[PDB]
UniProtKB/Swiss-Prot annotation, chain A:
Belongs to the cullin family. The Cullin neddylation domain restrains the RING domain of RBX1 in the E3 ubiquitin-protein ligase complex; this restraint is removed upon neddylation of the cullin. Transmembrane segments: none annotated. Component of multiple Cul2-RING (CRL2) E3 ubiquitin-protein ligase complexes consisting of CUL2, Elongin BC (ELOB and ELOC), RBX1 and a variable substrate-specific adapter; this complex is also known as ECS (Elongin BC-CUL2/5-SOCS-box protein) complex and may consist of CUL2 or CUL5. Component of a ECS(VHL) or CBC(VHL) complex containing CUL2, RBX1, ELOB, ELOC and VHL. Component of the ECS(MED8) complex with the probable substrate recognition component MED8. (Microbial infection) Interacts with human respiratory syncytial virus (HRSV) protein NS1. This is Cullin-2. Disulfide bonds: none annotated. It is found in: Nucleus. The chain holds residues 2 to 107 of 745 of the full protein. Neddylated; which enhances the ubiquitination activity of ECS (Elongin BC-CUL2/5-SOCS-box protein) E3 ubiquitin-protein ligase complexes. Neddylation leads to structural rearrangment in the complex that allows interaction between the E2 ubiquitin-conjugating enzyme and the acceptor ubiquitin. CBC(VHL) complex formation seems to promote neddylation. Deneddylated via its interaction with the COP9 signalosome (CSN) complex. It comes from Homo sapiens. It comes from the Eukaryota.
Swiss-Prot record, chain C:
The gene is APPBP2. It is found in: Nucleus; Cytoplasm, Cytoskeleton; Membrane. It comes from the Eukaryota. TPR repeats lie at residues 44-77. Rapidly degraded by the proteasome upon overexpression of a C-terminal fragment of APP. Component of a CRL2 E3 ubiquitin-protein ligase complex, also named ECS (Elongin BC-CUL2/5-SOCS-box protein) complex, composed of CUL2, Elongin BC (ELOB and ELOC), RBX1 and substrate-specific adapter APPBP2. Interacts with APP; APP interaction inhibits the E3 ubiquitin-protein ligase activity of the CRL2(APPBP2) complex. Substrate-recognition component of a Cul2-RING (CRL2) E3 ubiquitin-protein ligase complex of the DesCEND (destruction via C-end degrons) pathway, which recognizes a C-degron located at the extreme C terminus of target proteins, leading to their ubiquitination and degradation. The C-degron recognized by the DesCEND pathway is usually a motif of less than ten residues and can be present in full-length proteins, truncated proteins or proteolytically cleaved forms. This is Amyloid protein-binding protein 2.
Curated annotation (Swiss-Prot), chain D:
Belongs to the Elongin B family. Pathway: Protein modification; protein ubiquitination. The lineage of its organism: Eukaryota, Metazoa, Chordata, Craniata, Vertebrata. The gene is ELOB. This is Elongin-B. The keyword Phosphoprotein applies. InterPro entries: ELOB, Ubiquitin-like_dom, Ubiquitin-like_domsf. GO terms for biological process: positive regulation of proteasomal ubiquitin-dependent protein catabolic process; protein ubiquitination; protein-containing complex assembly; target-directed miRNA degradation; transcription elongation by RNA polymerase II; transcription initiation at RNA polymerase II promoter.
From Swiss-Prot, chain G:
It comes from the Eukaryota. The keyword Nucleus applies. One of its GO terms (molecular function) is protein-macromolecule adaptor activity. It comes from Homo sapiens (Human). This is Elongin-C. The gene is ELOC. Keywords: Host-virus interaction, Nucleus, Transcription, Transcription regulation, Ubl conjugation, Ubl conjugation pathway. Its main location: nucleus. SIII, also known as elongin, is a general transcription elongation factor that increases the RNA polymerase II transcription elongation past template-encoded arresting sites. Subunit A is transcriptionally active and its transcription activity is strongly enhanced by binding to the dimeric complex of the SIII regulatory subunits B and C (elongin BC complex). Pfam families: Skp1_POZ (PF03931). Ubiquitinated by the DCX(AMBRA1) complex, leading to its degradation by the proteasome. SUPFAM superfamilies: POZ domain.
Amino acid sequence: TSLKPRVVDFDETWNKLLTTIKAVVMLEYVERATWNDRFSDIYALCVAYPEPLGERLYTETKIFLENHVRHLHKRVLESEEQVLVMYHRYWEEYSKGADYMDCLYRY
Amino acid sequence: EWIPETLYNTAISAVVDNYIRSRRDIRSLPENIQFDVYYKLYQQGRLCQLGSEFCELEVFAKVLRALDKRHLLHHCFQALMDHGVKVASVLAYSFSRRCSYIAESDAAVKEKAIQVGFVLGGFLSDAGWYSDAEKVFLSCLQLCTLHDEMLHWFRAVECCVRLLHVRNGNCKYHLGEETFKLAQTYMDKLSKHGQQANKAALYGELCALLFAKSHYDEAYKWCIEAMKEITAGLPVKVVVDVLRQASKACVVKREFKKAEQLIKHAVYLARDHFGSKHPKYSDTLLDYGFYLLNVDNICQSVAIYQAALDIRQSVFGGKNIHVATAHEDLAYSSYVHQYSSGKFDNALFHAERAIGIITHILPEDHLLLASSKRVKALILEEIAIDCHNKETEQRLLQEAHDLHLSSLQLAKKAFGEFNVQTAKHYGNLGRLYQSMRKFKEAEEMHIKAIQIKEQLLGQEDYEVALSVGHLASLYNYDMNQYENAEKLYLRSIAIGKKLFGEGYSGLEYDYRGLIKLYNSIGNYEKVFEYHNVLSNWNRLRDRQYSVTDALEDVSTSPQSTEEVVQSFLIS
Amino acid sequence: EWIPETLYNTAISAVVDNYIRSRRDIRSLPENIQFDVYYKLYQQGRLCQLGSEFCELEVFAKVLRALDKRHLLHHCFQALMDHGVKVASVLA
Amino acid sequence: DVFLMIRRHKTTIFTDAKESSTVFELKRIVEGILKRPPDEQRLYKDDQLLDDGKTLGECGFTSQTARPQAPATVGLAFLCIEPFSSPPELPDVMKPQ
Amino acid sequence: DVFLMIRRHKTTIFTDAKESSTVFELKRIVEGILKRPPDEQRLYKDDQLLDDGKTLGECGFTSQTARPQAPATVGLAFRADDTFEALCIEPFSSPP
Amino acid sequence: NKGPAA
Amino acid sequence: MYVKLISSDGHEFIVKREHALTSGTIKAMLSGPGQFNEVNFREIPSHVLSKVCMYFTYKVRYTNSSTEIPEFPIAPEIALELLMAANFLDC
Amino acid sequence: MYVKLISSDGHEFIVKREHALTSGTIKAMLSGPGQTNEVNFREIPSHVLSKVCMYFTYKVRYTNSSTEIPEFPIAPEIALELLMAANFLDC
Ligand SMILES: [Zn+2]
């Protein structure tokens, strides 16, 4: 369980990562134990054996946020006559969340 | 102000001093950790322990993935090649040995080998070890032609574009044509199966192979073909490689306007993505300085080569073939810059290094020696003229006479008798025989240099005009038939002002030739006129010669990637 | 004309490519083989790999008993000194 | 030329035949060792019986898969092919321990 | 300055003070971490009795032997059931 | 003057 | 204000916040939703984490110091493990 | 005319006689009171002998071959034991 490089499946680790990262953006309460663990799994994926899962992680979080803003853009688009209050409603939940995700992906 | 060492750097030195006990478990470290352990071994000077693990392909596979610190791997790799152990040769052999073992294996394991082959083969191609990069690329090409799938021909064409690049720098031009023909087999097969492969980089390699064999008509034809298929989605390294070798074909085609808009953008684009201390950036300057060398931009042509060499020297260690070629251009640039002054002090030292680096790493019959030994012989020729002691002159001219014919024979074997480079040596020998007092042999050499170089280039070319000047300078002094040189000199000035204007360096020795020709027969109505021409010559070029380098000349480029491509193509 | 390579010379190329994973296993081989393994190190140019195999007195003694090819051994021992490794200083 | 081996229980025949050589004539070579009739013995590549009429090149035993470095394999029956042995596995070294 | 590795069971309390600082005022630092009375814990400096008063000058370790590069340790435990527990410090681990 | 271009 | 660091085996390594923030990782570990003090390490064991906390006090006060800085002592056996945790802690 | 070969596991490696002339040790089995000729080869296992007699077919066909001879693949895992047979058989 040490931080030595090791072979780790990407689907299971991403799925366990997907729960918290879905709440890191679009701010929500996340458990203390999760934040410590969800930073460890990033090291375990970028230092994966025998090939680092950094290209996969970068292109899967990008496609994760691809399905986030697009799903968020639909809600703002259908909210006619109140786009300004809705745009800032999610921007404060995203711009801080973007720094929140940048905080998690430091390594 | 005594900033404490980072725990990252502090722990690096903590395991290097205990390397022997923990040697096995260092290979289990992460790649970012692993590289800094090895780079510290070079910094401490423990090259033997550094070379104790780069000789394994698997260890060197992880190290090659440190893309940010690739500039440090090159400096360590060259250090090992000066340290002794042939880490380039063993890695190529070890990769080629393991490559043939997965021929019957699945394509999942196989595809990893090509990925390893391209990063390792590309690195050795960057490091200059073309003789070992070829064996790497030939192995990965073999895998791509085993199982017939659409992706396999998509990378087989990617081997032949780089196979043709490691054979252009290794002077294997005879095998270069076969690779291009072999490339068209998979390229056409991919085109039939609904995939038009990009013929931009692959056509771009002929812009150097045919340029090397002085096939300027064919190279410029392939210069246009290569430039058409460029695309903004291509890698920047691929794009800049096309522009450099396309610009070179324009310089020898006696076209200057479209060449500078190509190569300056090549300098700008290379400096942007890579930087000012990258090997690809320095590769552009040598091609860029080739433009400045032929447009009589002599003042900054030496500087741009001096800048180019310093980039390679900071990244490519000591005895490296790329440093020698950088040494080669700077050695010749100082040869023409110090022609009137005679200060061939650093010119010979760069030339001496050019011989020194290549002879250690390349075979004695390699063609790059012929290019390298030619310039050093030109250094020895002008040195013997400037020296006062006649005993020194008679020895150094023979030493230069040794190099030219040894260089000429290598050119003759690889290029054929009817080629510019073989005729280029004939022009050198004619000038050499003038200093060697073999005037009758000088006459034979000059007529050989002018009946062959002019035969295929045409009646109007830069180098043909100089070859006339060599024989024009002959009849003025040794043969003393001034009627022959009267028509010859008139040709030298004629071609000189077509492209270079009046203020050209070779024209100074041409206008002076007419006065010297006229002074013998007592003609004076033209001597007074041509003395005013020299006064016009002495000022007009020096009116517009003020100090200005080329790195800030290009500066930021208003021209974009597409603004340069279409402008050159339509014109 | 184009003779096939000897099985001994083919197998000696197999171990030398696998040197990292079998460096510790090569010390148990007979004395008439260990010289060939360390000779293939020098023939391929592995000067730095060979230094770790001659600075050790325990394994250099087995190579020393292969006196049939001592003329080849004198060249390898001289090669490392020009290479830079002071095997003689370490052996002493 | 086509090189291949046959194993019934523990035997291994390293014989050679032309790419157009058929199946009937190579059983005579096998008869010289096992002393068994050619019609009684039957050979089995990739769990498939081979006819006597078809040649070695018509069943897939071509030159590239039957090289003199790593030839193609085929069974034999009158399958009970015994594996040779398990080589001592080598640590990956590069793999973390 | 004098640096300490005062610890108890799983705790590895990190703190710093001056060379002439009182040993008593270090307990106020511990008071600000675990929210315990200063007399609740007992300082077992090198498995022996250490008075609540005194000072770090003559405590038994100075700035030279307690640099941040290698600070010294002092045992600690809290009084449970009105009885002062003995020191119960354990090694971190046993790496190979 | 000086020499041919390389 | 004090930050509690727990290793893999549960042994805690409380230390001041100011000396902790010299590490980019722990700066990006307490920040975000973890602001709530308390962080945990699933992979890092105690013996190496004890040395990291030892380094934390070393960095802050020896920064831009006029005197010559003594070298940081690292055990030869801990040297490999501490280096592995150096990049992860980014300190 | 046919030369047999037994292994540690009892595997049979009956092959052609003139394919075995490359290794002189096999001829020593045929020589002496050995003159199929019974041979005992217990110390060398079957899996490595699957490459020993495999080399014989490679050896005899490429004797004075006009084309360039491809290398004989020797797996890195079996490299150590196969080299034992190379010196033992003088092949
Ligand atoms: Zn060395």
